Amino acid sequence: RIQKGPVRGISFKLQEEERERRDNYVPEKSEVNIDKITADPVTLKMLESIGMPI
Amino acid sequence: NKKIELYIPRHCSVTHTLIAADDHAAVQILVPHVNENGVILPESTVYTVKGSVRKDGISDHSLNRQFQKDGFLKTVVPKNMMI
Amino acid sequence: PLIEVDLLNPTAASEAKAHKMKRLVPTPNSYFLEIKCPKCGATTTTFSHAHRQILCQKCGQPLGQPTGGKLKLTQQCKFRIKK
Amino acid sequence: TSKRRNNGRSKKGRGHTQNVRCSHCGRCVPKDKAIKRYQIKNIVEAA
Amino acid sequence: TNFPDILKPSAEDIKMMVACRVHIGATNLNFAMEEYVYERGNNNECIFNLMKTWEKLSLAARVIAGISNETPSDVVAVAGREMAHRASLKFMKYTGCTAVAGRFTPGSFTNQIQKKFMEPRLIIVSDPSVDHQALRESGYINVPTIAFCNSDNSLKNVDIAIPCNNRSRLSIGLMWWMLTREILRYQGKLARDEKWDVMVDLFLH
Amino acid sequence: WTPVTKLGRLVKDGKVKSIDQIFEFGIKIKEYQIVDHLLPGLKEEVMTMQSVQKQTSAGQRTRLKAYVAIGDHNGHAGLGVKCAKEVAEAIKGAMIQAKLAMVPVRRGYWGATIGEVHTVPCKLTGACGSVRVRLVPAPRGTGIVAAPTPKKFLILAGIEDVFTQTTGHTKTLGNFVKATYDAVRQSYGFQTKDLWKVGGVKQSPMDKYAKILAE
Amino acid sequence: VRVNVLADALKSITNAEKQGKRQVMIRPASKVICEFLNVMMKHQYITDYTVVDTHRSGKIVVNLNGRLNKCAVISPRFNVTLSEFDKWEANLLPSRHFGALVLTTSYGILDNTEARAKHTGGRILGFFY
Amino acid sequence: GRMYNPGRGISRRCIPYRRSAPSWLKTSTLEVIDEMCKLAKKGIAPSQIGAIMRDTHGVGLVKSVTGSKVLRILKLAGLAPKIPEDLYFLMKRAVSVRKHLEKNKKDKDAKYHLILIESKIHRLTRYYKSAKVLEASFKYDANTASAIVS
RNA sequence: AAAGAAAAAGGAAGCAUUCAGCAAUAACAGGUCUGUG
RNA sequence: ACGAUCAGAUACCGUCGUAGUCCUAACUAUAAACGAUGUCAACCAAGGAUUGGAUGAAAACCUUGUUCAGAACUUAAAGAGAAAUCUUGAGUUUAUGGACUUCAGGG
RNA sequence: AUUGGAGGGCAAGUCUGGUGCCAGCAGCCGCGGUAAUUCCAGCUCCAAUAGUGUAUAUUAAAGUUGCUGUGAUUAAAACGCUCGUAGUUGAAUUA
RNA sequence: UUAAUA
Predict the structure, then answer these.
(1) Of B61, D5, E131, E141, which has the fewest CB atoms closer than 10 Å, so is most exposed?
(2) How far apart (Å, rounded) are the C-alpha atoms in residues E9 and C64?
(3) Which of helix, strand or coil describes residue C72?
(4) Cα–Cα distance measured from residue A8 to residue E104, given in angstroms and rounded to the nearest whole number
(5) DSSP state, C32?
(6) GO: which molecular function terms (chain A) (predicted)?
(7) Does the CB of C4 have a partner CB in chain B at under 8 Å?
């Protein structure tokens, strides 16, 4: 079962090292956009109420 | 001679009532002061909430009146409730 | 209510929602109005929650029908609230 | 004592309800206290 | 004063919060969080006042940084929902405050003979609805609590509440990240005029 | 020895010198060795040893339930309950529970401030089950006008003069003492006129000694 | 129906303080209700109150500060003699230094301490700890 | 609540906090008195008389304009009915039920409510006699109320 | 998804392989003072 | 009154069947006539839904906001109780007193 | 220096001789059927003491008669319901 | 279907 997939009660050194290499992986280009934004018209009510336009 | 009182008890900052020795839900929140750069100071303002206040689900609002009064919050509690 | 508001100074929105008597100082929800009869130029002053058929002061042109709580003015009758 | 808050009925600001007859034993039971079930079946069995 | 001019949020944080749909609450509104809600949405969804969310967030961060200066281990942060396990663990990494990711054992705060007997001075909970067990134990050990509450949540045994969305991963990851960044800023370890190296995507699940 | 809780660590170092310091901030006591350290020479009084029984397939499972009361004669008292298969283990377990249930007893004067403090400050009522015990302040000469069961407890709390008016099934010795402990327990929770003043800002021992405890 | 408006007012105030409320509203205002509140204020059990006129025996708003344990009225106002003050005080007040009765006398509505000084008895109204 | 049945309704009228006449009202007391006395001659109850002025003439309260109540004005003008308005309307209802009861002898809810209605009459008559409005020689008789209340 | 279940093959052995030994808490006022210095 | 069942069965089961069941007039005046909870009044923690009005929005009925009245329900770490349970009270009671009537005193 | 008692209520004996569900003790629970802490006796000591037991009655205990002060869903106990006279209780308001 | 007692 371990070879097929992880097991809840089993945790070995190899499994922990694989987790640390993959969870800390950070994309070079973040998936949060900057030059698109854009939302529905009623979203713009709070941005302008707060005090900043897009 | 000997002191009359074993101790002088604390007063809840919301209800202005004594905190019993057995009140095991009474919290104490310390809010440190900050300098002009936003870095906190060793000193702090102490706050006390009685056990019954917390269990009713009203301690959060009751504190917000006290936090706003002392300046830690500015635009949280509206005017008609700022009492 | 667990959250409590100021009782001396109630907001306009809260006072408008309350029942006409349960306000701080009870006020009526009614008012006195005048209607411009379509047939002529005359104006008839009347109650808001009138309990009878209302005709023009000049001629017998009807202007409202009483329906259990407020006058039902005709679609071509224009009115202004007397202050 | 009171095994049920509603006394086992469906009764409220009434206080007398008509009787209905049991489907099996023919007993008289009040309309609200009776155990009502609905049946919708074909007149031909699946065989 | 007690809320100096430097603690107001920049436009980017308000830009980021809307990008992560933090402001959007649930349908049913609890009586305790009526103040935070600004106006019901088009589809009867509560929309939180983002200014009040930040004011509560900075106040919560100030309280945490006060305790965590001397003994960071006296702050315990629990995250019942799997969409907050990574965020709580990342908070543990950069602050040193003990974190609980899995199921909360009912008695870890009161059973002194138990080997995982943890004695905190402050508890942070990601959801009062999910983490009721940690919340209810604070009523036995005299410990204040901080919570990230949605509009439907019950505000019992909580003393500082952060009104925010706490279901979507973007909403959950951002608030933990913003809380950690503000905690360090009050601690002085992070200049208020510079950008944090770790981005939000590290906190997201 | 070998304390496990933070307060237990503090008292063993001799940092919390007064039991009243713990009561001020409402810190729970979880080690009976703490009370022994802070209140030496406590007096013991076992109120009763009632035997309960559980019906089983083979018969009855008899256990002995011990009600013991503890407390020095200077305003502290505690009541603990424990049931065990042996008298020796029942008393020892109840004795431990009595120390954990220590409570402060506020007492005052009757008519004037002539030392020393002798009687309860006001009228206090303890609400057990059907048993209800009322305590009334009394002049100097009168002893504890009460049944022997709560008189033994009221002596250990240092209350030299009091008046009592009991109501309910006082033959229930378990509830009779439990109601007395309830009346005394709320003596310091009742806000009289003399407690209106907030006093001065004090520091909790758990906050100002947190650096040493963690390290 | 409403027989004792002072009973309705004093039960409102105690219920407000048990829940820890900051202020309470009393719908029918009377002279006796105002004089009872003034006695409590002189001993600093309430902060203040404001009488709002509604042309219909208007309302009273009382501000409470964590101090009034219990204020109550007493059913039929017994004629209290100066020799009966101790018998009433021993029954209604928790101790000899804390509580205070309230009596209506020819010299106004006073408490037991200043009615004793003026050497006058009267019908008892209530008390407060 | 209501005197006889367990109903509890709070349907009331709310007098405004202005004891004087409104600014927009310019009619004098002479016009009010003459119009209100003209309605009194038409056989109209004071409760209805005030309503007609409020709906038609915009005089919603008469104590605000003339300084005295409707009944006092009619007493001064001699138009106050001998039998007070609330007692007359109660005797009219008792007669109406009693007439229906003649043909329908088996109606037991009408006999119950006739008992309640007539108890109201004896409660009001007791009060008015003590208030000297009704002479002590007045007495309600079912064999007599048919003619006086018609 | 898991603890597991049912063929079949292989095997000397595949019902926990089969048959037994030891076998907890509490109890009977079950038999023996005619086994006992 | 029959026929079963049973040791017997004057009963449960089956068949027949007088009074009664139904309407009118008149008596009777009792029920686990129960919410086993007297009538009136004040204060009183969170909700969702419903019956009937009023009042805005949304084109008689439906969907929503507010408010009055009605029969109910859910949650409580709170109040009470011997507990079950009660919360539109069975709460606000040894911190004992809002008004009135009826009833109980071991079996 | 006597009187009453030594299982519990209730201070005082798991001492020795007889007695064997018999005699009997026992205000109440109960003890006695052959190994009686309770019967009948011997010794010892428990209480009061020139007094000490018993019986009947008053008072407290009794918040088991309630004005202070009771209880009424299930322990006993809210009239089937409404009207109704006496009785009791009755909104604010006057320098 | 029938099924009493100590």
Answers:
(1) D5
(2) 58
(3) strand
(4) 17
(5) E
(6) structural constituent of ribosome
(7) yes
